[PDB]
Ligand SMILES: C[C@H](CS)C(=O)N1CCC(CC(=O)O)CC1
């Protein structure tokens with residue numbers, strides 16, 4: 001429990017079968033930026049949400065899983081086509097892991113400097129993933145909340161836990177800004193943040209890319225800040 005340093009990465013147990021992975025990249029004007037994703041054990045397999053920033057860091061996530069869990073990684077899903085979430089796709093492919101992203105993330109990946117995932121998720125008009133596109137996802141419940149941080153951003157709840165992951169859409173309850181809005185839909189952000197909250201009403205622990213886990217005040221605060229963009 002608590003933070004475990006493993007090379008240049010940090011791992012933190014959040015629930016009996018859920019860990020947060022954290023990796024860092026220098027960005028001028030922002031410093032060494034943390035990005036979080038998730039590792040979930042579902043019976044005899046492991047599921048990953050988001051890569052680390054780089055292939056080397058992502059291979060270290062797989063090394064941590066080997067050491068600490070020692071079960072095969074059945075699949076990975078990534079939450080949009082920016083480097084913090086998709087930068088390590090080649091490491092997953094080298095390891096033989098099946099990879100999934102929003103169809104739109106895969107379409108955008110080359111222009112964003114990313115390698116596409118192998119499989120494309122599609123979404124119903126109400127935002128829930130079309131189940132045939134997310135086979136064998138076990139407790140991962142994938143939801144497209146609308147355009148926000150990016151047009152392609154997706155979110156993931158973990159069935160059987162109190163955890164939902166907002167990726168880079170959600171910031172914590174004390175954040176001063178919405179971060180990188182360069183690819184954002186400023187008109188729709190607030191609604192998208194609120195739709196994430198409404199999709200996962202029982203999630204009391206909100207995990208996000210660039211803050212430590214928080215309560216649902218992360219959602220309300222993020223949406224209230226995004227009201228300013230309209
Ligand atoms: C590469 C990523 C893709 S979301 C990015 O653009 N940034 C990292 C996060 C910072 C905001 C922060 O430090 O919390 C903005 C810049």
Ligand SMILES: [Zn+2]
Nearest residue numbers: 080082149168
């Ligand atoms: Zn992003």
Ligand SMILES: [Zn+2]
Nearest residue numbers: 082084168209
């Ligand atoms: Zn990000």
